[PDB]
Enzyme design. Structure first.
Site, PDB file in Angstrom:
ATOM      1  N   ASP A  17       0.895  -1.227  -0.009  1.00 47.85           N
ATOM      2  CA  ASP A  17       0.046  -0.094   0.030  1.00 47.85           C
ATOM      3  C   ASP A  17       0.952   1.274  -0.020  1.00 47.85           C
ATOM      4  OD1 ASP A  17      -0.765  -1.267   3.063  1.00 47.85           O
ATOM      5  OD2 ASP A  17       0.938  -0.165   2.606  1.00 47.85           O
ATOM      6  N   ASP A  19       0.268   4.834   1.148  1.00 43.74           N
ATOM      7  CA  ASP A  19       0.443   5.437   2.405  1.00 43.74           C
ATOM      8  C   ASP A  19       1.165   4.972   3.715  1.00 43.74           C
ATOM      9  OD1 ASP A  19      -2.161   6.492   1.102  1.00 43.74           O
ATOM     10  OD2 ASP A  19      -3.224   4.784   2.402  1.00 43.74           O
ATOM     11  N   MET A  49      -8.062   3.476  14.603  1.00 45.95           N
ATOM     12  CA  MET A  49      -6.844   2.537  14.776  1.00 45.95           C
ATOM     13  C   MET A  49      -7.522   1.087  14.008  1.00 45.95           C
ATOM     14  SD  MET A  49      -7.217   2.645  18.842  1.00 45.95           S
ATOM     15  CE  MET A  49      -6.189   4.011  18.958  1.00 45.95           C
ATOM     16  N   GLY A  50      -8.418   0.797  14.793  1.00 47.91           N
ATOM     17  CA  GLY A  50      -9.026  -0.614  14.274  1.00 47.91           C
ATOM     18  C   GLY A  50     -10.224  -0.689  13.494  1.00 47.91           C
ATOM     19  N   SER A 106      -3.749   0.877  -1.879  1.00 47.53           N
ATOM     20  CA  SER A 106      -3.911   1.862  -0.631  1.00 47.53           C
ATOM     21  C   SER A 106      -5.283   2.455  -0.676  1.00 47.53           C
ATOM     22  CB  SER A 106      -2.910   2.991  -0.980  1.00 47.53           C
ATOM     23  OG  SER A 106      -3.467   3.783  -2.049  1.00 47.53           O
ATOM     24  N   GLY A 107      -5.690   2.917   0.508  1.00 49.64           N
ATOM     25  CA  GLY A 107      -7.003   3.651   0.825  1.00 49.64           C
ATOM     26  C   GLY A 107      -6.895   4.831   0.123  1.00 49.64           C
ATOM     27  N   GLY A 108      -5.876   5.075  -0.633  1.00 45.30           N
ATOM     28  CA  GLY A 108      -5.770   6.464  -1.315  1.00 45.30           C
ATOM     29  C   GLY A 108      -6.556   6.828  -2.317  1.00 45.30           C
ATOM     30  N   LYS A 155      -8.720  -3.926   1.041  1.00 42.36           N
ATOM     31  CA  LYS A 155      -7.340  -4.508   0.799  1.00 42.36           C
ATOM     32  C   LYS A 155      -7.107  -5.978   0.535  1.00 42.36           C
ATOM     33  CE  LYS A 155      -4.327  -0.548   2.103  1.00 42.36           C
ATOM     34  NZ  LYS A 155      -4.061   0.144   3.209  1.00 42.36           N
ATOM     35  N   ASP A 176       2.467  -0.624   6.277  1.00 40.14           N
ATOM     36  CA  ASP A 176       2.888  -0.054   7.453  1.00 40.14           C
ATOM     37  C   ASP A 176       2.144  -0.115   8.568  1.00 40.14           C
ATOM     38  OD1 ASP A 176       1.421   2.234   6.184  1.00 40.14           O
ATOM     39  OD2 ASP A 176       1.724   2.760   8.418  1.00 40.14           O
ATOM     40  N   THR A 179      -3.324  -2.068  10.266  1.00 37.47           N
ATOM     41  CA  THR A 179      -4.185  -1.613   9.506  1.00 37.47           C
ATOM     42  C   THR A 179      -4.553  -2.236   8.254  1.00 37.47           C
ATOM     43  OG1 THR A 179      -3.452   0.228   8.216  1.00 37.47           O
ATOM     44  CG2 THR A 179      -3.398   0.481  10.544  1.00 37.47           C
TER      45      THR A 179
END
Lengths: 222, 222
Positions: A17, A19, A49-50, A106-108, A155, A176, A179
């Protein structure tokens, strides 16, 4: 450790990912700082966070709060904030001469994660980031809701979407943080990154960890 | 002109309808053309005849097949395919001068009517229409589904909002079709135009109906 030579050899395709993993900075936050909601979104993210409120949910809020214009996104890739991490660039470069398929999850927004995937010769058909919508008047109109990476489990789904299509042999995931660490099972393997951000969640608790590709470019350069 | 004198000034504001009245051309049929998909469309508009409005979904299907791009429509606007009706680029001013606030109303994309306005000296705030959405790449995304002109009878839902907000107590709507006349019971006096299209279902049933526009402007000249 001892299974880093063959593990990373018997590979068929690897993906990570954007980010804080393939890019130093965070697309969403680097996209907000351009506005004036840096403080908000940044806390709006780390508070997520979670499984605290699925991804799709928090994505709209955090985004509704932002309201980015095409102009804005067009001038970010101009001030090209996304910075590649010290390793990555090459780590994948030599990985292409091995024919081993590489991917970005990525969540991007590809609106950006696509420009990043360029410094690396990775075709756009190998990118997976929810998309941003705009009005012909160049104004935030929401985002593509039918994007697997729009909500939780995203993901780990795109990966499977890849197995039940490319019938790969060894698929590795590198994020990273946990997550998205919970994607190893769907995939064939995982590595937690921490060069830009650590987070215990993946640090001490994660098989085959790592920090800074450089501090592992050796075991690879071997 | 018998008693039309009351209308046309001595009124308040006159919301004109663009498709087939302020411009001869068709709002969407013109787009489906630069999209290489005319006839493809020119056959959906068949069984979906007037009086019957599956609408919205009818517009989404019709746009789903055209799939215009921020660039494609951009090149159309840059080709200015729309041609305003003879007596409008002059008659519109003939009411603004008399301090009369004119408004353009449509269900055929704001990307077009805005230029129609800007090329008619009609304020940008006086244009209500549908908004299309595009992706960074410029691909088609959809349209504003909350916009009033989204669902059926929206011509009125706005002609009514322009009242509880600006107050006019004497607003006229210039139309050519049953959807333009259908906003009359919600609005004030309705005048049907047909300098582009007749549509009997509104000519021999609606009071006050003019064939041309110049046969309305060259009258209060003496």
């Amino acid at each position: 450790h001892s299974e880093l030579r063959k593990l990373f050899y018997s590979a068929d395709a690897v993906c990570f990912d954007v980010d804080s993993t393939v890019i130093r900075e965070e697309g969403i936050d680097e996209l907000a700082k351009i506005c004036g909601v840096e403080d908000a979104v940044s806390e709006m993210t780390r508070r997520a966070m979670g499984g605290a409120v699925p991804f799709k949910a928090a994505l709209t809020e955090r985004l509704a709060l932002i309201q980015p214009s095409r102009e804005q996104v067009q001038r970010l890739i101009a001030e090209q904030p996304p910075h590649l991490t010290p390793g990555i660039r090459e780590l994948v470069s030599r990985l292409q001469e091995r024919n081993v398929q590489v991917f970005l999850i990525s969540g991007g927004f590809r609106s950006i994660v696509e420009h990043v995937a360029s410094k690396l010769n990775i075709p756009a058909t190998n990118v997976f980031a929810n998309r941003l919508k705009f009005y012909f008047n160049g104004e935030y109109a929401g985002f593509d809701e039918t994007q697997p990476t729009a909500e939780s489990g995203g993901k780990g789904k795109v990966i499977k979407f890849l197995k039940e299509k490319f019938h790969f042999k060894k698929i590795i995931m590198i994020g990273d943080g946990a997550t998205d660490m919970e994607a190893c099972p769907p995939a064939d393997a995982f590595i937690g990154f921490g060069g830009n951000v650590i987070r215990q969640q993946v640090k001490d608790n994660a098989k085959w960890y790592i920090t800074d590709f450089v501090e592992l470019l050796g075991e690879l350069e071997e």
